[PDB]
Amino acid sequence: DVKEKIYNVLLFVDGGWMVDVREDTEEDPERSHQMVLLRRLCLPMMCFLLHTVLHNTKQYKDCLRLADIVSSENQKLYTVFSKTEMRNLLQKLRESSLMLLDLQLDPLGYEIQS
Amino acid sequence: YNILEMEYAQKRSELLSPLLILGQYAWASNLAEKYCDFDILVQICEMTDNQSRLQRYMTLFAEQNFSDFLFRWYLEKGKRGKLLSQPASQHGQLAAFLQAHDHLSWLHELNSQEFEKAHRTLQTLANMETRYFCKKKTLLGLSKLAALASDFQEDVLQEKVEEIAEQEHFLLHQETLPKKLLEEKQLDLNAMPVLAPFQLIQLYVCEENKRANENDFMKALDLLEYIGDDSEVDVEELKLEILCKAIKRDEWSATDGKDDPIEATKDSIFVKVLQNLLNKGIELKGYLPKAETLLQSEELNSLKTNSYFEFSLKANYECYMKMQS
Amino acid sequence: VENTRKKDAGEFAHHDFAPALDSGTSEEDRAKIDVIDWLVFDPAQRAEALKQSNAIMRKFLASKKHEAAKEVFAKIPQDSIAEIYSQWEEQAMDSALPAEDDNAIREHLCIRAYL
């Protein structure tokens, strides 16, 4: 249940989480600004939550795929947020790679190295 | 003198045998620390569960670069976990050692904030990857993340993002395969190698595909421009085969049998493909065979029913070429 | 709503605007939450009530006041989106899809998914 919920939150409609369908060019742009701010401040939080979930459930393949999911342009995550959040995401990815390599499995891709 | 020192080291190695057979790793290390040696100490500290000995050896012989041998022994003995979990203090030595092993070099650079080197390594890996489409797309996503987190110029980062987006759109041709056809061919997603554009064109041409819309023709036309397998192969024959298959899959050459040479051709697939190409902007006379070639081809005599079909197709093609040129 | 927002100092602590008050949760948040009682009791003001709730909950989430946002989201039922859709589909015409209404609908759906 929680995996399906987090997957739906990540791959919600209109690309990333909370994406404005119509621009507020004729009303109040403050709503769109607040939506963008909340998205850029909450997407790393959901990423860390899913990283911890996959760490506890042994899903290093999904942990590695989360990097590509974040880098995808559908989530509108072009590294324009907090450097502290970037460092925390990098530390989580390094921990995932270390936990995957501890079981004699290289983190290159999803299986053994080429 | 070199031969003398070589045979002397060989005699030392031959003498060092009963102590290693019996045991006493601490005594062996205390005996070997009197001479200038590093590999034996590294191996005797790695094969045991005593980290304080390795720590004091490192603090004593840090002037002799006590890091390369440790990295080599961690990589050879399968201790890549400890190699990656090593503390942050020997990043330069780790990079100089892993410069030949990219599968760990990219992760080490990402950890050491060498975003440019990590992105370059990931791009090289994605370019050298020949099989495993899932691994290729994973490396492409990792390279996209590294380029987005890189410290290069804004224009260079935008160009890299556009290139990775074009690569993702090229992989979308294989991603947009019907699950029914995938299950019939027995391969499943995330388990197929990097399919060639010619292979994708053959799959769209064969009857095993569960689709018959203009999306397959558009994907084939895009793969014709994309690189992969159509380099040495001439694109003229591929375009001719695509046009022949589009004529064969029409809903008038073998489906309908009326006598009106107007709507019968418009209710097909060829007219829709021509209209899509005209709306996109591709030339219908240079990127596609000519009307003379289509008439001289032997497929018309086997795919025709009356002269109305051929005349209407020729007239529509000529009018489209005239309005495009 | 305007008088309730003007009688206080102002809850503003975002990165795109100028900061105002940011020191936790005080009586201002409780007053702004309780002022929605009339809007939620009025049967012809559900859209404005949902809009104001979203507008205050986004500011709370920006200023790190997730407790008040969760409270104001759990106090209201989970049928305002369906009611708005039914009211828009029963009148047999649309106003070219209101941008603010679509934004509020998306915000409510995303907040429900987040919770």
Coordinates of C-alpha atoms in Angstrom, one line a residue:
Chain A
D1 CA 0.0 0.0 0.0
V2 CA 2.7 2.5 1.0
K3 CA 4.8 1.6 -2.1
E4 CA 1.8 2.2 -4.4
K5 CA 1.0 5.5 -2.6
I6 CA 4.5 6.8 -2.8
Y7 CA 4.7 5.8 -6.5
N8 CA 1.5 7.6 -7.3
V9 CA 2.7 10.7 -5.4
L10 CA 5.9 10.6 -7.4
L11 CA 4.3 10.0 -10.8
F12 CA 1.1 12.1 -10.3
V13 CA -0.6 13.7 -13.2
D14 CA 1.0 16.5 -15.2
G15 CA 4.5 15.2 -14.4
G16 CA 5.8 16.1 -11.0
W17 CA 4.0 16.6 -7.7
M18 CA 1.6 19.5 -7.6
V19 CA 2.0 21.0 -11.1
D20 CA -0.2 24.0 -12.1
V21 CA -2.5 23.0 -15.0
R22 CA -3.2 26.6 -16.0
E23 CA -0.9 29.6 -15.3
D24 CA -2.2 32.3 -13.0
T25 CA -1.5 35.1 -15.5
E26 CA -5.0 36.6 -15.1
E27 CA -5.5 36.2 -11.3
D28 CA -2.9 35.8 -8.5
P29 CA 0.6 34.6 -9.4
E30 CA 1.3 34.2 -5.6
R31 CA -0.6 30.9 -5.7
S32 CA 1.6 29.5 -8.4
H33 CA 4.7 30.8 -6.6
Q34 CA 3.6 29.1 -3.4
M35 CA 2.9 25.9 -5.3
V36 CA 6.4 26.0 -6.9
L37 CA 8.0 26.7 -3.5
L38 CA 6.1 23.9 -1.8
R39 CA 6.9 21.5 -4.5
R40 CA 10.7 22.3 -4.5
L41 CA 10.7 22.1 -0.7
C42 CA 8.7 18.9 -0.4
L43 CA 10.0 16.7 -3.2
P44 CA 13.4 16.1 -1.5
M45 CA 11.5 15.2 1.6
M46 CA 9.4 12.6 -0.2
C47 CA 12.6 11.4 -1.9
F48 CA 14.4 10.9 1.5
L49 CA 11.3 9.1 2.9
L50 CA 11.2 6.7 -0.1
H51 CA 15.0 6.2 0.2
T52 CA 14.6 5.2 3.9
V53 CA 11.7 3.0 2.9
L54 CA 13.7 1.2 0.3
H55 CA 16.7 1.0 2.7
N56 CA 14.5 -0.8 5.3
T57 CA 12.8 -3.0 2.6
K58 CA 16.0 -3.9 0.7
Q59 CA 15.4 -2.2 -2.6
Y60 CA 18.7 -0.8 -3.8
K61 CA 17.6 -1.1 -7.5
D62 CA 14.7 1.2 -6.7
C63 CA 17.1 3.5 -4.7
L64 CA 19.3 3.8 -7.8
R65 CA 16.3 4.3 -10.1
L66 CA 15.2 7.2 -7.9
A67 CA 18.2 9.1 -9.1
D68 CA 17.0 8.8 -12.7
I69 CA 13.4 9.6 -11.7
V70 CA 14.5 12.8 -10.0
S71 CA 16.8 13.7 -13.0
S72 CA 13.8 13.2 -15.4
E73 CA 12.3 16.5 -16.7
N74 CA 8.8 15.3 -15.7
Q75 CA 9.4 16.1 -12.1
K76 CA 10.8 19.6 -12.9
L77 CA 13.8 19.0 -10.7
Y78 CA 16.8 20.8 -12.4
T79 CA 18.8 21.1 -9.1
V80 CA 17.3 24.6 -8.4
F81 CA 16.6 23.9 -4.7
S82 CA 18.5 23.6 -1.4
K83 CA 22.2 22.6 -1.6
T84 CA 21.6 20.9 1.8
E85 CA 18.9 18.8 0.2
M86 CA 21.2 18.0 -2.7
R87 CA 23.9 16.9 -0.2
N88 CA 21.4 14.8 1.8
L89 CA 20.2 13.1 -1.4
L90 CA 23.8 12.4 -2.4
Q91 CA 24.5 10.9 1.0
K92 CA 21.4 8.7 0.8
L93 CA 22.5 7.5 -2.7
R94 CA 26.0 6.8 -1.4
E95 CA 24.6 4.8 1.5
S96 CA 22.3 2.8 -0.9
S97 CA 25.3 2.1 -3.2
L98 CA 27.4 0.9 -0.2
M99 CA 24.6 -1.3 1.1
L100 CA 24.2 -2.8 -2.4
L101 CA 27.9 -3.4 -2.8
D102 CA 28.2 -5.0 0.7
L103 CA 26.3 -8.0 -0.9
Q104 CA 28.8 -8.3 -3.7
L105 CA 26.6 -6.4 -6.2
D106 CA 28.1 -3.4 -8.1
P107 CA 25.8 -0.3 -8.2
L108 CA 26.4 0.1 -12.0
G109 CA 22.9 0.0 -13.4
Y110 CA 20.7 -2.6 -11.7
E111 CA 22.9 -5.7 -11.8
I112 CA 26.6 -6.7 -12.0
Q113 CA 29.1 -4.4 -13.7
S114 CA 29.5 -4.5 -17.5
Chain B
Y1 CA 73.2 -5.3 -7.7
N2 CA 69.6 -5.5 -9.0
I3 CA 69.9 -9.3 -9.4
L4 CA 71.4 -9.5 -6.0
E5 CA 68.6 -7.6 -4.3
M6 CA 66.0 -9.6 -6.3
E7 CA 67.4 -12.9 -5.2
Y8 CA 67.8 -11.5 -1.6
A9 CA 64.1 -10.6 -1.6
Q10 CA 63.3 -14.0 -3.0
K11 CA 65.2 -15.7 -0.2
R12 CA 63.4 -13.5 2.3
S13 CA 60.1 -14.6 0.9
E14 CA 61.2 -18.2 1.0
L15 CA 62.3 -17.8 4.6
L16 CA 59.0 -16.2 5.6
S17 CA 56.9 -19.4 5.6
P18 CA 56.8 -21.3 9.0
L19 CA 55.7 -18.2 10.9
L20 CA 52.9 -17.5 8.4
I21 CA 51.9 -21.2 8.5
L22 CA 51.7 -21.2 12.3
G23 CA 50.1 -17.9 12.8
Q24 CA 50.7 -14.9 15.2
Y25 CA 49.7 -12.1 12.8
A26 CA 50.7 -9.5 15.4
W27 CA 54.2 -10.9 15.8
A28 CA 54.6 -11.3 12.0
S29 CA 53.6 -7.6 11.6
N30 CA 56.0 -6.5 14.4
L31 CA 58.8 -8.4 12.7
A32 CA 58.0 -7.1 9.2
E33 CA 57.6 -3.5 10.2
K34 CA 61.4 -3.3 10.7
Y35 CA 61.9 -3.3 6.9
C36 CA 60.5 -1.1 4.1
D37 CA 57.4 -3.2 3.1
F38 CA 53.8 -2.3 2.4
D39 CA 52.0 -5.1 0.5
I40 CA 52.6 -7.7 3.2
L41 CA 51.4 -5.4 5.9
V42 CA 48.3 -4.5 4.0
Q43 CA 47.4 -8.1 3.3
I44 CA 48.1 -9.2 6.9
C45 CA 45.9 -6.4 8.2
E46 CA 43.1 -7.1 5.6
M47 CA 43.1 -10.9 6.2
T48 CA 42.6 -10.3 10.0
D49 CA 40.0 -8.6 12.2
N50 CA 42.4 -6.0 13.7
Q51 CA 41.8 -2.5 12.5
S52 CA 44.1 -0.8 15.1
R53 CA 47.1 -2.4 13.5
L54 CA 46.2 -1.1 10.0
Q55 CA 45.5 2.4 11.6
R56 CA 48.9 2.6 13.2
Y57 CA 50.6 1.3 10.1
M58 CA 48.9 4.1 8.1
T59 CA 49.8 6.7 10.7
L60 CA 53.4 5.5 10.7
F61 CA 53.9 5.1 6.9
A62 CA 51.6 7.9 5.7
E63 CA 54.7 9.5 4.1
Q64 CA 55.2 6.6 1.7
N65 CA 51.7 6.9 0.3
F66 CA 49.9 4.2 2.3
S67 CA 46.7 4.2 0.3
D68 CA 47.3 2.8 -3.2
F69 CA 48.2 -0.6 -1.9
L70 CA 45.1 -0.6 0.4
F71 CA 42.8 0.4 -2.5
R72 CA 44.4 -2.3 -4.8
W73 CA 43.9 -5.0 -2.1
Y74 CA 40.3 -3.9 -1.4
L75 CA 39.5 -4.0 -5.1
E76 CA 41.2 -7.4 -5.8
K77 CA 40.0 -9.2 -2.7
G78 CA 36.3 -8.2 -3.4
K79 CA 36.2 -5.7 -0.5
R80 CA 34.6 -3.1 -2.7
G81 CA 32.1 -2.4 0.2
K82 CA 34.9 -1.3 2.5
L83 CA 36.7 0.4 -0.4
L84 CA 33.6 2.6 -0.9
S85 CA 33.0 3.0 2.9
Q86 CA 36.6 4.2 3.4
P87 CA 36.7 7.6 5.2
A88 CA 36.8 10.9 3.3
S89 CA 40.5 11.7 3.4
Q90 CA 42.0 10.0 0.4
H91 CA 39.8 11.2 -2.4
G92 CA 42.6 12.1 -4.8
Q93 CA 44.3 8.7 -4.4
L94 CA 41.0 6.9 -4.8
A95 CA 40.3 8.8 -8.0
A96 CA 43.8 8.1 -9.4
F97 CA 43.3 4.5 -8.6
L98 CA 39.8 4.1 -9.9
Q99 CA 40.5 6.1 -13.1
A100 CA 40.5 2.8 -14.9
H101 CA 37.4 1.4 -13.2
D102 CA 34.5 3.7 -14.1
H103 CA 31.8 1.7 -12.4
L104 CA 33.2 2.8 -9.1
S105 CA 34.9 6.0 -10.3
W106 CA 31.5 7.7 -11.1
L107 CA 30.2 7.0 -7.7
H108 CA 33.4 8.1 -6.0
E109 CA 33.4 11.3 -8.0
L110 CA 29.7 11.9 -7.1
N111 CA 30.6 11.4 -3.4
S112 CA 33.7 13.6 -3.7
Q113 CA 31.6 16.4 -5.4
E114 CA 33.6 15.9 -8.7
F115 CA 30.4 16.5 -10.6
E116 CA 32.1 17.3 -13.9
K117 CA 34.2 14.1 -13.8
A118 CA 31.2 12.1 -12.7
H119 CA 29.1 13.4 -15.6
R120 CA 31.9 12.7 -18.1
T121 CA 32.3 9.1 -16.7
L122 CA 28.5 8.5 -16.8
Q123 CA 28.3 9.8 -20.4
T124 CA 31.2 7.6 -21.5
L125 CA 29.6 4.6 -19.9
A126 CA 26.2 5.3 -21.5
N127 CA 28.0 5.7 -24.9
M128 CA 30.0 2.5 -24.5
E129 CA 27.0 0.5 -23.3
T130 CA 26.0 -1.9 -26.1
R131 CA 23.4 -4.2 -24.4
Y132 CA 20.9 -3.9 -21.6
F133 CA 18.4 -1.1 -22.4
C134 CA 17.5 -0.9 -18.7
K135 CA 21.1 -0.4 -17.7
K136 CA 21.6 2.1 -20.5
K137 CA 18.6 4.2 -19.4
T138 CA 19.7 4.0 -15.8
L139 CA 23.2 5.3 -16.8
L140 CA 21.5 8.0 -18.9
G141 CA 19.4 9.1 -15.9
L142 CA 22.5 9.1 -13.7
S143 CA 24.3 11.2 -16.3
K144 CA 21.4 13.6 -16.4
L145 CA 21.5 14.0 -12.6
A146 CA 25.2 14.6 -12.7
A147 CA 24.9 17.2 -15.4
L148 CA 22.1 18.9 -13.5
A149 CA 24.2 19.0 -10.4
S150 CA 27.4 19.9 -12.3
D151 CA 29.2 23.3 -12.1
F152 CA 29.6 23.9 -15.8
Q153 CA 28.2 26.8 -17.8
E154 CA 24.5 27.3 -18.1
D155 CA 24.6 26.9 -21.9
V156 CA 26.7 23.7 -21.6
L157 CA 24.3 22.3 -19.0
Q158 CA 21.3 23.1 -21.2
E159 CA 23.0 21.4 -24.2
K160 CA 23.7 18.3 -22.2
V161 CA 20.1 18.2 -20.9
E162 CA 18.8 18.5 -24.4
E163 CA 21.1 15.7 -25.6
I164 CA 20.0 13.4 -22.8
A165 CA 16.3 14.3 -23.6
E166 CA 16.9 13.4 -27.2
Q167 CA 18.4 10.1 -26.1
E168 CA 15.4 9.5 -23.9
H169 CA 13.1 10.3 -26.8
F170 CA 15.1 7.8 -28.9
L171 CA 14.7 5.1 -26.3
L172 CA 11.0 5.9 -26.2
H173 CA 10.7 4.1 -29.6
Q174 CA 11.6 0.9 -27.8
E175 CA 9.6 2.0 -24.7
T176 CA 6.4 2.3 -26.7
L177 CA 6.2 -1.4 -27.5
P178 CA 2.8 -3.2 -27.0
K179 CA 2.8 -5.5 -23.9
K180 CA 0.9 -8.1 -26.0
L181 CA 3.7 -8.3 -28.6
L182 CA 6.3 -8.3 -25.8
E183 CA 4.7 -11.3 -24.1
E184 CA 4.3 -13.0 -27.5
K185 CA 8.0 -12.6 -28.3
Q186 CA 8.9 -13.6 -24.7
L187 CA 11.4 -10.9 -23.5
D188 CA 9.5 -8.5 -21.1
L189 CA 10.6 -5.0 -20.2
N190 CA 13.8 -4.2 -18.3
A191 CA 15.4 -7.3 -19.7
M192 CA 16.0 -6.4 -23.4
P193 CA 19.3 -5.2 -25.0
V194 CA 19.7 -1.9 -26.8
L195 CA 17.4 -2.6 -29.8
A196 CA 18.7 -1.1 -33.1
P197 CA 16.6 1.3 -35.2
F198 CA 16.6 -1.2 -38.0
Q199 CA 15.3 -3.9 -35.6
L200 CA 12.6 -1.5 -34.4
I201 CA 11.6 -0.8 -38.0
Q202 CA 11.4 -4.5 -38.8
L203 CA 9.3 -5.0 -35.7
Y204 CA 6.9 -2.3 -36.8
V205 CA 6.8 -3.7 -40.3
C206 CA 6.1 -7.3 -39.3
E207 CA 2.5 -8.4 -38.5
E208 CA 3.5 -9.3 -34.9
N209 CA 3.0 -5.6 -33.9
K210 CA -0.5 -5.0 -32.4
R211 CA -0.6 -1.4 -33.8
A212 CA -1.5 0.0 -37.2
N213 CA -1.6 3.8 -36.7
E214 CA 0.7 6.6 -38.0
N215 CA 2.6 6.5 -34.7
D216 CA 4.7 3.6 -35.9
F217 CA 5.5 5.4 -39.2
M218 CA 6.5 8.5 -37.3
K219 CA 8.7 6.5 -35.0
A220 CA 10.3 4.9 -38.0
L221 CA 10.9 8.3 -39.6
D222 CA 12.5 9.6 -36.4
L223 CA 14.7 6.5 -36.1
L224 CA 15.8 7.1 -39.7
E225 CA 17.3 10.4 -38.6
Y226 CA 18.5 9.0 -35.3
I227 CA 21.8 7.2 -35.2
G228 CA 22.4 3.6 -34.2
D229 CA 22.2 1.2 -37.1
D230 CA 21.3 3.2 -40.2
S231 CA 24.8 4.7 -40.7
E232 CA 26.3 2.4 -43.5
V233 CA 22.8 1.3 -44.6
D234 CA 21.3 3.5 -47.3
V235 CA 18.1 5.3 -46.1
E236 CA 16.5 5.3 -49.5
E237 CA 15.7 1.6 -49.4
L238 CA 14.4 1.9 -45.9
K239 CA 12.1 4.8 -46.9
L240 CA 10.9 2.8 -49.9
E241 CA 10.2 -0.2 -47.7
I242 CA 8.3 2.0 -45.2
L243 CA 6.2 3.5 -48.0
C244 CA 5.5 0.1 -49.4
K245 CA 4.4 -1.1 -46.0
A246 CA 2.2 2.0 -45.6
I247 CA 0.6 1.3 -49.0
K248 CA 0.0 -2.4 -48.0
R249 CA -1.5 -1.4 -44.6
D250 CA -4.0 0.9 -46.3
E251 CA -7.8 0.5 -45.7
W252 CA -8.6 0.6 -49.4
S253 CA -6.1 -1.6 -51.3
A254 CA -7.6 -4.7 -49.8
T255 CA -10.3 -3.7 -47.3
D256 CA -12.8 -1.5 -49.1
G257 CA -14.1 -2.0 -52.6
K258 CA -16.3 0.9 -53.6
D259 CA -16.2 2.9 -56.9
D260 CA -15.6 6.4 -55.5
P261 CA -11.9 7.4 -56.1
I262 CA -12.3 10.3 -53.6
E263 CA -13.0 9.3 -50.0
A264 CA -11.7 5.8 -50.5
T265 CA -8.1 7.0 -50.6
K266 CA -8.7 9.6 -47.9
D267 CA -10.0 6.9 -45.5
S268 CA -6.6 5.1 -45.6
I269 CA -3.2 5.4 -43.9
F270 CA -1.2 6.9 -46.7
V271 CA -3.1 10.1 -46.9
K272 CA -2.9 10.5 -43.1
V273 CA 0.8 9.9 -43.1
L274 CA 1.3 12.4 -46.0
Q275 CA -0.8 15.0 -44.1
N276 CA 1.2 14.5 -40.9
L277 CA 4.5 14.8 -42.9
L278 CA 3.2 18.0 -44.5
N279 CA 2.2 19.5 -41.1
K280 CA 5.5 18.5 -39.6
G281 CA 7.5 20.1 -42.5
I282 CA 9.5 17.2 -43.9
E283 CA 10.0 17.2 -47.7
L284 CA 7.8 14.7 -49.5
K285 CA 10.1 14.5 -52.6
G286 CA 13.5 14.2 -51.0
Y287 CA 12.8 12.2 -47.9
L288 CA 10.4 9.9 -49.8
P289 CA 10.4 8.0 -53.1
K290 CA 9.1 9.7 -56.1
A291 CA 5.8 9.1 -57.9
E292 CA 7.6 7.7 -60.9
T293 CA 9.4 5.2 -58.6
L294 CA 6.1 4.3 -56.9
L295 CA 4.5 3.7 -60.3
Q296 CA 7.4 1.6 -61.6
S297 CA 7.4 -0.5 -58.5
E298 CA 5.9 -4.0 -58.9
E299 CA 3.9 -3.7 -55.7
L300 CA 1.2 -1.7 -57.5
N301 CA 0.3 -4.6 -59.9
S302 CA -0.1 -6.9 -56.9
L303 CA -1.8 -4.5 -54.5
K304 CA -4.2 -2.8 -57.0
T305 CA -7.9 -3.5 -57.8
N306 CA -8.8 -0.8 -60.3
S307 CA -7.0 2.1 -62.0
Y308 CA -8.9 4.6 -59.8
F309 CA -6.7 3.7 -56.8
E310 CA -3.5 4.2 -58.6
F311 CA -4.6 7.4 -60.3
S312 CA -5.9 8.9 -57.1
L313 CA -2.7 8.0 -55.2
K314 CA -0.5 9.5 -57.9
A315 CA -2.6 12.7 -58.1
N316 CA -2.6 13.1 -54.3
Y317 CA 1.2 12.5 -54.1
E318 CA 1.8 15.0 -56.9
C319 CA -0.4 17.7 -55.3
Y320 CA 1.2 17.1 -51.9
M321 CA 4.7 17.5 -53.4
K322 CA 3.6 20.6 -55.2
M323 CA 2.1 22.2 -52.1
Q324 CA 5.2 21.2 -50.0
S325 CA 7.8 22.4 -52.5
Chain C
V1 CA -11.7 37.2 6.0
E2 CA -10.1 40.5 5.0
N3 CA -10.8 42.0 8.4
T4 CA -9.4 38.9 10.2
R5 CA -6.2 39.1 8.1
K6 CA -5.8 42.8 8.7
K7 CA -6.5 42.8 12.4
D8 CA -3.3 40.7 12.9
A9 CA 0.3 41.4 12.1
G10 CA 0.4 39.1 9.1
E11 CA 1.7 35.5 8.6
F12 CA 4.3 35.8 5.9
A13 CA 7.6 33.8 5.8
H14 CA 8.3 32.8 2.3
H15 CA 11.3 33.1 0.0
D16 CA 9.6 34.9 -2.8
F17 CA 8.0 37.5 -0.6
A18 CA 9.0 39.6 2.4
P19 CA 9.1 37.9 5.8
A20 CA 6.9 39.0 8.7
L21 CA 6.2 36.7 11.6
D22 CA 7.8 33.3 12.0
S23 CA 8.2 31.9 15.5
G24 CA 6.1 28.7 15.7
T25 CA 2.3 28.4 16.3
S26 CA 0.4 31.0 18.3
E27 CA -3.1 32.4 18.5
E28 CA -3.0 33.9 15.0
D29 CA -3.1 30.4 13.4
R30 CA -6.0 29.3 15.7
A31 CA -7.9 32.5 14.8
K32 CA -7.4 32.0 11.1
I33 CA -8.5 28.4 11.4
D34 CA -11.6 29.3 13.4
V35 CA -12.6 32.1 11.0
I36 CA -13.4 29.4 8.4
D37 CA -16.3 28.2 10.5
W38 CA -18.7 30.7 8.9
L39 CA -17.4 29.9 5.4
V40 CA -17.8 26.1 6.0
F41 CA -21.3 26.6 7.5
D42 CA -22.5 28.7 4.6
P43 CA -23.9 26.3 2.0
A44 CA -23.1 28.6 -0.9
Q45 CA -19.5 29.4 0.1
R46 CA -17.8 26.0 -0.1
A47 CA -15.6 27.1 -3.0
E48 CA -14.4 30.2 -1.2
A49 CA -13.9 28.2 2.0
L50 CA -11.8 25.6 0.2
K51 CA -9.8 28.4 -1.6
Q52 CA -9.1 30.2 1.7
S53 CA -8.2 26.9 3.4
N54 CA -5.7 26.1 0.6
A55 CA -4.3 29.7 0.7
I56 CA -3.6 29.5 4.4
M57 CA -2.3 25.9 4.4
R58 CA 0.2 26.7 1.6
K59 CA 1.5 29.6 3.7
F60 CA 1.6 27.3 6.8
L61 CA 3.6 24.7 4.9
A62 CA 6.0 27.3 3.6
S63 CA 6.5 28.7 7.1
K64 CA 6.8 25.2 8.5
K65 CA 3.4 25.0 10.2
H66 CA 2.3 21.6 9.0
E67 CA 0.2 20.9 12.1
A68 CA -2.3 23.7 11.3
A69 CA -2.5 22.7 7.7
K70 CA -3.2 19.1 8.6
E71 CA -5.8 20.2 11.1
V72 CA -7.6 22.5 8.6
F73 CA -7.5 19.7 6.0
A74 CA -8.9 17.1 8.3
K75 CA -11.6 19.3 9.6
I76 CA -13.1 19.8 6.1
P77 CA -14.7 16.8 4.4
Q78 CA -13.3 15.1 1.3
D79 CA -16.1 15.9 -1.1
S80 CA -15.6 19.6 -2.1
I81 CA -13.9 18.5 -5.4
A82 CA -16.8 16.2 -6.3
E83 CA -19.3 18.9 -5.4
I84 CA -17.5 21.5 -7.6
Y85 CA -17.3 19.0 -10.5
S86 CA -21.0 18.2 -10.1
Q87 CA -21.9 21.9 -10.0
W88 CA -19.8 22.5 -13.1
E89 CA -21.2 19.6 -15.0
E90 CA -24.9 20.2 -14.1
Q91 CA -25.1 23.7 -15.4
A92 CA -24.4 22.5 -19.0
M93 CA -21.7 25.1 -19.5
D94 CA -18.1 25.8 -18.4
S95 CA -16.2 29.1 -17.9
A96 CA -13.2 27.8 -19.8
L97 CA -12.0 26.0 -16.6
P98 CA -11.1 28.6 -13.9
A99 CA -7.4 28.7 -13.3
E100 CA -7.7 29.3 -9.6
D101 CA -10.3 26.6 -9.2
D102 CA -8.2 24.0 -11.0
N103 CA -5.2 25.0 -8.9
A104 CA -7.2 24.6 -5.7
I105 CA -8.5 21.2 -6.9
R106 CA -4.9 20.1 -7.7
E107 CA -3.7 21.3 -4.3
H108 CA -6.5 19.5 -2.5
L109 CA -5.8 16.3 -4.4
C110 CA -2.0 16.5 -3.8
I111 CA -2.6 17.3 -0.1
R112 CA -4.9 14.2 0.2
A113 CA -2.3 12.1 -1.5
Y114 CA 0.5 13.4 0.8
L115 CA -1.6 12.7 3.9

